[model samples]
Target chain A: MVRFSRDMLQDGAKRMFKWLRKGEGLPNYLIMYDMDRNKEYKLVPKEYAGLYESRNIFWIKNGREPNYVTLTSVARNPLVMDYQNTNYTCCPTSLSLASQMLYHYKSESECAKALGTSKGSGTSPAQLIANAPKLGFKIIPIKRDSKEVKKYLKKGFPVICHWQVNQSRNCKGDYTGNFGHYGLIWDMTSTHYVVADPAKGVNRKYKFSCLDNANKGYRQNYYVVCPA
Target chain B: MVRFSRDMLQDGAKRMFKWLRKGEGLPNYLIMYDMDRNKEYKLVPKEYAGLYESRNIFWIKNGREPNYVTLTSVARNPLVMDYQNTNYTCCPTSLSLASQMLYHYKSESECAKALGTSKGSGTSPAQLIANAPKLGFKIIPIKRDSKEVKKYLKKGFPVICHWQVNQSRNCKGDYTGNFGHYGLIWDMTSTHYVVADPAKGVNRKYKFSCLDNANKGYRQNYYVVCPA
Candidate 1:
């Protein structure tokens, strides 16, 4: 019975970004349009955030403590944020977030143009790494285990992790679009992982669930967006 | 991208049911609405229907074959069809479809009323079976496994089978709604099984490739709604 129109959904997404402009939260909301079911889904970060972690972990809203550990220090960092202007912008926005960790002023449009605009299916991790030099960064492919990710994070680099969620298995009651999703894995520990999920458009941590260890295992499946 | 308006989707669904009205195809077009991604997925029966079987089967178009195998020897058995008038009408419609196959004159309102107006979480299999006597039929809980289902089909009873899909591991690229779905098992062979899927409002066959046996032997999950 909770029905949402397309325009209303667009407005909600805009509001989430607007909150970010004020440095209110780390884009803590995800507005999804299930193209398959023609329905709208709203995801608040609290649901996926590391509730299973050691503690609530103080949150990352505004200019909070853990926020300093992130790449952006001044203000909101949704620079390459795909405002949902286009369907094929997850790669650009996610890669831009990873690149922005180092460049600080990289435009999502530039990333989109470099990687692609959906000419091929999506940007390959190899392609993303090969082109890192021009983006003012060093490329490093870390081993798949979570410890390697922690090592990179401890060394001041955010790893880009690829994950997927189909509308069918979503927490929301109804949704239909199915695609690969990307997130910037910025911090981690033995039991929790801190990620700036471009899909949810937030900087939060989640329990090291199957989100990272997809397919066979994390080693065989994930990529690290290493910076120089 | 085939962008469809809400009205257009409604029309497509109506067309599919129209073929069913003339007692044509046994409702074989699946309209999948993925709520998370905001896209509509149109799955014509051909994709799942015996696609795993030995010989290739040509599809039924606007009005075609196997529509006759249904128990509805009349036109427009959906007098009780939920018609998707309300978003929460899936319970009403699917239950009504199952009811219509039996009572042949049941109304969707009757189904919705008997099931309680969202009073319970959703219509459980136990609830559906318990309510069948008043709806002009008797319910039988069949054993799990494809072989038992085959026995039911050979006995000339369309069995209602319930299963679920999680979007994270789903294969169909366009699907998004990740919830338990209900289908009427109409016919089956050693390799293929035919189902009148209420979700898509169409009939199709799927491979015995563990589609029926869900979650470690299905002993603890799923059910069979055998109407007598």
Candidate 2:
């Protein structure tokens, strides 16, 4: 567990000024503490930066990308990323990966047929929830929360999460932006969730908060489909 | 929201070395990014610090104290800190403060009677949960999580959370350590939960993660007791 300290803030303050100027990846926040008041404030670019002149500045930075090194660990289950070869097969591809983790392998096409995926309209979570048993799984629907996903991952199960991401891969290996999408969470570190995105890639790392904020979609639900 | 940057990390590394030498509040982590592998690692005082000699050094520090300046806000409810003037009255005192927020004022002694607080065991969460209705409040018990407390605070209702703390008010205003206790959560910033800790003081700030970790207890419950 991380504890409170003076140096952590000073580092964040230094980064906040640089990134705030560039207008690129923003630091989660740069916090400045006033030792006199024993209070801390989240720093922004133009406004709070002004306080730097007045207060005895000690600061820290928080953001999605890890500020520390996390040990690498993966699910014990030998699950491989299954790419959605077709335009609208993410649902099937994810199901296939989750199934593989449980030692029962179902091909993407087989899952697609069972889930009733079509080119015009992609497969819905409701469809998966309904038809998972037919594909040899018991689907448990849960309101998406950090703990729920970790609980499943701890049990060596891959949780199928629904979120929005850029439909098209932005650059090589990077699928940026928000598009309604489905992915399998196979592993996690302290700061990020490791996802197997059919359209994106396997073992794509996303910060934990990203799943709650940038990744949330109308689907509102995540599923844990265990072998029936 | 904070983003990843090399500068932020470098500053953390700088502070980490300094603090690591002094052995005070340890950093949440000092992360070093390996550009060659495109991976980041959490740095420790001894083992991982050795990596600094091997890898290209870009680092960030994470910890409890703020890395940025946050705007300040408080609960709109006109609730004042009612100290548990007597030993073993934290539960009643917190209930009284929660009651006053909803415009119903119940003295600590009155709440103590309804809650059945005894000097032997003090007050159990079950006691407060069972007797809240008799005191003109309807208690809704929830398994505590970060989101649950925030939801209640957003509705402008103070949430009564149970956790452990050092019973003795160690060092003025800072009652540190873990002793089973109750406090009112009335406000929050992005990173900290603003709690009106009866034993510690009102408007005491704690990191959000603290509630789930150091604050957790055998009670395994928190309550939202609303006006009946």
Candidate 3:
């Protein structure tokens, strides 16, 4: 019994409609139960059931509005992929992920070398500020708040935030590890910031209070970069 | 006096119109003799007379349609810049320019190193096919003709072209150096292809026959790269 989230349902609906518009028969990848339209749709052949795990269908019960997270409609950028790997390269990995959102590609190893990242230690904000330009990006100053970062995200710039890893939550809404960490903020909803965390997972939601509270010290600063 | 082609005049017109739309007054860069509308337009505050020398107004006195080469309406790509430098980097420069047309930026030197370019020698088609993937591009097979290549250009992909340098004409319609070279074809007209020649200049027009004829042997190949 796999549960699907509102995002998944919406995505699947769009894909189903596109295939239908092209006069293609229904797909078998996943089944969508559309409550609004009161319809069920399948979107691919040979449906993989495992793909639907850990998702919850957005059922509007009572009078509460749905807090469904949505991705930005920015063009020409790679979506966040799982960045968890055996290395202390989370800092560069974050930049690599963020750079793709700006229509540039930098491999994790490339950013690691640029930031002089070592296996035993992590990267710092000052290091990012000093070296991002060398990689063809210019770090722009931004206010350390959800409102300002949201503005940049709407303008198609991904923002990087430094937060205490222990205080931040993962995709499962569980508090993650301790110490400092850098994450790329790709989008935001009314109550959650969609983060691409190198150490956690891509597009995981973190409550605005959680990230804002975790942001501390010289690295508490929220940063954004644009192509130089 | 410098001889300006029809392409330059059209580009200047668009720039002039954009400035006008922004509610800015007439610019002083160069006087545009709009024989079609029987008017003149200047598009900048500081008039640079030299800019006008190499340019010609599109004068349609006869019945023949003005062969003004127009660029494609493809979005978000770098226009060809004069790539002439004191190095044997033409092949990589061509790829670099073409890559930008697909919304990815690779520096000339970055591409040079990828193709194993040397100061005394240029790159080969086999080299591009083999190494472009490492740079996040997949080489797709394409027919070596204007019609086919134009299809890709309209689809927003720049095509890489191989030709004999001595046989091909430069921006000025003069024969260039001897031996082989690589260039990027960004757009085309009925009679000409708009090329970004690494050794010559960007957006230079060449008669279709000129490039087609010079395209001979192991390098007579036309190639296209999409993000891998």
Candidate topping DockQ: 1
Which is superior by lDDT, 2 or 3?
Answer: 2
- Give Cα-based local distance difference scores for all models: 0.43, 0.57, 0.56
- Scored by Cα lDDT, where does model 1 land? 0.43
TM-score of each: 0.33, 0.33, 0.34
Using Cα atoms, each model's DockQ against the true complex is: 0.04, 0.01, 0.01
True contacts kept of 3: 0.00
C-alpha lDDT of residue B11 in model 2: 58
lDDT of 2 by residue, B103-215 (tens): 34466778999999998899998899889888777777876676887776555456787776542233222432344777887778887777876543456677766665654
Candidate 2 local Cα displacement, residue A49, angstroms: 53
Instruction: Please compute the TM-score of chain B alone for each predicted structure, in the order given.
Output: 0.51, 0.61, 0.62
lDDT of 1 at B87: 26
Residues B1-228, candidate 1: write the lDDT tens digits.
223333433444444434433423444545644334556665444421211010001011011111111110112222111122232444445555554343232444576676563633556666666775565545567665677776554443456666653421242211233455455665666676665543332334566544555333223333443333
Q: Model 1 chain B, poorest ten-residue lDDT window?
A: B52-61
Interface Cα RMSD for candidate 1? 22.0
For model 3, how does the per-residue alpha-carbon lDDT over B92-206 read when each residue is reduced to its tens digit? 8788776544434466667888988877766778888899877767776677788888777665567888877556544233332356777888888898988876543455587
